[PDB]
Design a protein around this ligand. Sequence first.
Ligand SMILES: Nc1ncnc2c1ncn2[C@@H]1O[C@H](COP(=O)(O)OP(=O)(O)O)[C@@H](O)[C@H]1O
Ligand SMILES: Nc1ncnc2c1ncn2[C@@H]1O[C@H](COP(=O)(O)OP(=O)(O)O)[C@@H](O)[C@H]1O
Ligand SMILES: [Mg+2]
Ligand SMILES: [Mg+2]
Lengths: 89, 170, 40, 207, 49
Amino acid sequence: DTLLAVGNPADLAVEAIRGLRTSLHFAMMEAKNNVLMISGASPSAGMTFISSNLAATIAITGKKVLFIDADLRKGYAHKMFGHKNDKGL
Amino acid sequence: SPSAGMTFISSNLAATIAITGKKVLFIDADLRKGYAHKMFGHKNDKGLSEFLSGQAAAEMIIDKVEGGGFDYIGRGQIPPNPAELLMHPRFEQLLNWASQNYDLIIIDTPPILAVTDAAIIGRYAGTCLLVARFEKNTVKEIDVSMKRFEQSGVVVKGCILNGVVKKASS
Amino acid sequence: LIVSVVLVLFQVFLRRGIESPEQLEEIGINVYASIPISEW
Amino acid sequence: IDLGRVIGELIDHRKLIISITSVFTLFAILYALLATPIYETDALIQIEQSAPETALLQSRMILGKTIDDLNLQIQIEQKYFPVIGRGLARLMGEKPGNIDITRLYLPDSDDISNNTPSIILTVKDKENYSINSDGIQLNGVVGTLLNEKGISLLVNEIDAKPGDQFVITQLPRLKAISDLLKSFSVADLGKDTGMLTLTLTGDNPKR
Amino acid sequence: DAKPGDQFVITQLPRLKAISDLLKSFSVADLGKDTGMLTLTLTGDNPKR
Ligand SMILES: Nc1ncnc2c1ncn2[C@@H]1O[C@H](COP(=O)(O)OP(=O)(O)O)[C@@H](O)[C@H]1O
Ligand SMILES: Nc1ncnc2c1ncn2[C@@H]1O[C@H](COP(=O)(O)OP(=O)(O)O)[C@@H](O)[C@H]1O
Ligand SMILES: [Mg+2]
Ligand SMILES: [Mg+2]
């Protein structure tokens, strides 16, 4: 229940996510604002895994990152991050 | 893929361009398994890592090859965060400073199917060339590498076959 | 002879690596050189 | 595809093709030069029909009478340790020896599977020899009969160099009959004549 | 002839059933189609019986 990008920063998956970060740094240019939305087709696909790890890998480069868990139905980001569960979204 | 010939081709090309009277700089940006300093004769202190992390200046990193004629900058100590180091603006400062004092700068990089260092560096590279092993690599792997460089914003000029042998079936 | 021929056929039909810059030039990739192996 | 591709591939893999063909040919040469030769003898019988006689020739009665006459139930094998010792011994010009045995009777252990008792006879000289059944060593001499430990044995005219060893097996009568019948064949060759061709194949040209 | 503690099922099957069982595994052939030779074959699990 801890971030892969923190427990094992040298894993293959985190390398692939760093590749995704470098792709995004060019794709996310000329966008109307700096908001990224990771979604999916079916549950248990990897939206939270990808989103959280990507946020970690972009935060480690000195850029401030905000992570919103708008999964108001079965979200568990506070469980994986260490939480004060009061006053959520 | 690794063990394709990036270091072999890059070092030999740097030598062959240095022997024609043009100053050449050779940067070994393979911060994970680079051994250029082993092949050139080394003062392994103050590599590229020690400059990127900020604990060294731009002058103690550059060394002279003995039987070459071109300068080089070894990787140095293996860092724990290579891809996160390469994003530092000091790397671009180093390249901009070197481009005004040398006629050619050749950067060796790790593979792109394995890590993402090559695609981070490729933003400041004027020209980029892939190296394809003769029998090992495939057309699919080279196409995937080209597209992965395209996604990250790096335009690859072309390929360089390597390890060619004479086959009667040709 | 038969086993040698079938083994050679299997090896030929199981190879996938590049064999000539023509394959890379079909896709639209300019092969700038072809460095031979150095026995030295 | 085209012929040029296949010719080029063959030329490229010439080394592998040659190596595999050479090793297979070497194995074939070894087998064809080490396999025990099998000679064939034949005879011609005039019948004064021929189908009932063809069936009766291979009956157990006649073959059993022949085996009882010639003592074919005493199997004698020259011993070579490997699976190729006999072939190389024949190739080297070594003369195979032989022992004439007229009387053999083993204790007939007759366990669940091994119904064929066997002993090992080692040649010590032209006259005496050693016998071992299950490690029990005994000394015998050609001529005088041996009757010891439930083993009766008679040896005549042993012809081999000293130090040779021979496996002596007393296989059952039915097994000997089956072995004889397996290599023995009869044909009519005319389908109406009294001529019958009898064929027998074996490794001993005189036996 | 058995070790003590062994058990055996002894069945008195009818004569017709025994005849059918014997006939099922018993075969006859001519092998010459004209000779007086007949080959009789019997298959069973007891080598002496
Ligand atoms: N590449 C991956 N490797 C290992 N585990 C993964 C990977 N991607 C997702 N998961 C794990 O499988 C589970 C489902 O992913 P998750 O994103 O949390 O659910 P959802 O897609 O419905 O939001 C999670 O427990 C996650 O840790
Ligand atoms: N044309 C070649 N002829 C002979 N050796 C070569 C050739 N190309 C590469 N090599 C050798 O094979 C090894 C792999 O090449 P290298 O570039 O050093 O690794 P990598 O591609 O992973 O950076 C090296 O030891 C190199 O000397
Ligand atoms: Mg989720
Ligand atoms: Mg290298």
